[PDB]
């Protein structure tokens, strides 16, 4: 999807963290203390799941995957080496219009936020009606917000298929753009957020966002995958050890930008 300089030797297989840019920082940071001490970092776009297929059939060298039980079945299968590395927080939130017709109050825990979500939607008499976009496309952010409903002993999906329950298969820009527009409930996460216009963001209201607590459901931790398999092998460990070395990775994830604001959380103190 594209590579960096700062000869291949190495490649990631990830999905958000390159689409907001920080993989170009983080390659280009890497390349930098490779030379600059004693070669081009290729990035390849792909989910969780397609990222540990790559690290199976050598695709690639290292994967940044957003599951952590995803990642232990990865190891215990010997496709990505023992133990995984934490790279970096990252943050989903759930927003909705400035109506609120959820009636949703900001100190509420998100699970009963979903549950008031269903009821009202369920009701289906207020102004606007309750509705939730789904991005239905087996994205970390649908998995988040799939797994939501689930917490309330909620199906939408399945049948007696709940109508508010909205299927927008799009990007994530799109996604929040839409539902914004349409007055709809979303989760979605920081770095979209901070990519619409200014404008938008008034048209909407922060429900939730999610906080560095370890066991916060809307805290999406970042870890890299070293392949058993991986070509250029001890560039992979390279990289992972420099990724979480408060002196490499972690200084340029801690100053990594975007609309004058901190993107990610550094990973947690080790
Ligand atoms: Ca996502």
Redesign the pocket.
Known sequence: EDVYDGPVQLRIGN??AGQSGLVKELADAFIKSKVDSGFKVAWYKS?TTVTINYLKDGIVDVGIT?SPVAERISIKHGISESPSYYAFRDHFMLIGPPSNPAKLSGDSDIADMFSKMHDAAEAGNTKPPVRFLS?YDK????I?EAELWLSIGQVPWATAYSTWYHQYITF?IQALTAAILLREYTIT?YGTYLSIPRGLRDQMVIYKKGTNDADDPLLNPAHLLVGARAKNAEMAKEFAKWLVSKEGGQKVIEGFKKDGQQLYSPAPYR
């Open positions: 999905g958000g989910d957003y991005r994205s970390a952010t649908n988040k994530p996460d």
